[PDB]
């Protein structure tokens, strides 16, 4: 349905992934109050950094929403390759912030799991691998998106960069897909811990 409209869907995916993630954060805090005694072992910092990246992503989503309206208002002017490219930068930044949050939730689930369950049963060894795999995959897609972004910002000045833009849509989409797998892995982990200890 056109790049601007697809951008709207990526943004909506990102926002819905952030609500899902905040639900995982809630799950983790419930587990943390049963299993741990205070902010030792990195937990005070975990709480602080959950809050800091949440506030950053809220702010990136608000900026992407405003850029989205602007791009939609100017669809008939034809001219905004730079608006589309700007929105690609915004979405990438949001994805990166989401990924920091995801890595914090992964770390939390791991720290809690280590205290109450062996790492060697119940799907946990596969979980560890899948977490590692998707984290590597997401990092690779983020790196590729950063490189594509720099390239697109260059091509737009010259002849044109329509192909680079479509490729970047693909990059961002795949990153969001991979992050959804990671999110689903974190939901699984939380449910195992909840079944065990609550």
């Amino acid at each position: 349905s056109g790049i601007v409209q697809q951008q709207n869907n990526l943004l909506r995916a990102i926002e819905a992934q952030q609500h899902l993630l905040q639900l995982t954060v809630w799950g983790i805090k419930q587990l943390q109050a049963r299993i741990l005694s205070g902010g030792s072992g990195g937990w005070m910092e975990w709480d602080r950094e959950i809050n800091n990246y949440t506030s950053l992503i809220h702010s990136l989503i608000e900026e992407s929403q405003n850029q989205q309206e602007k791009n939609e208002q100017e669809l008939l002017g034809g001219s905004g390759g730079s608006g589309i490219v700007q929105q690609q930068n915004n979405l990438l930044r949001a994805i990166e912030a989401q990924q920091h949050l995801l890595q914090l939730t992964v770390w939390g689930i791991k720290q809690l799991q280590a205290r109450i369950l062996s790492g060697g049963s119940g799907g946990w060894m596969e979980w560890d691998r899948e977490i590692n795999n998707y984290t590597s995959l997401i990092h690779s897609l983020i790196e590729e998106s950063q490189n594509q972004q720099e390239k697109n910002e260059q091509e737009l000045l010259g002849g044109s960069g329509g192909s680079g833009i479509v490729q970047q849509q693909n990059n961002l989409l795949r990153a969001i897909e991979a992050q959804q797998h990671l999110l689903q892995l974190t939901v699984w982990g939380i449910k195992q811990l909840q079944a065990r200890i609550l």
């Binding site: 819905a16 479509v166 939901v187």
Partner: protein, 35 residues
């Protein structure tokens, strides 16, 4: 029974995300029409 609320909210964002990704992918395979 909040956790089964929680597990509600998760599955019904999850369904929304899957729909959005599917729609964006089936936009992407139009973008690659444009290319």
């Amino acid at each position: 029974x909040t956790w089964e609320x929680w597990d509600x909210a998760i599955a019904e964002y999850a369904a929304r995300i899957e729909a959005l990704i599917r729609a964006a992918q089936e936009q992407q395979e139009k973008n690659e029409x444009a290319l």
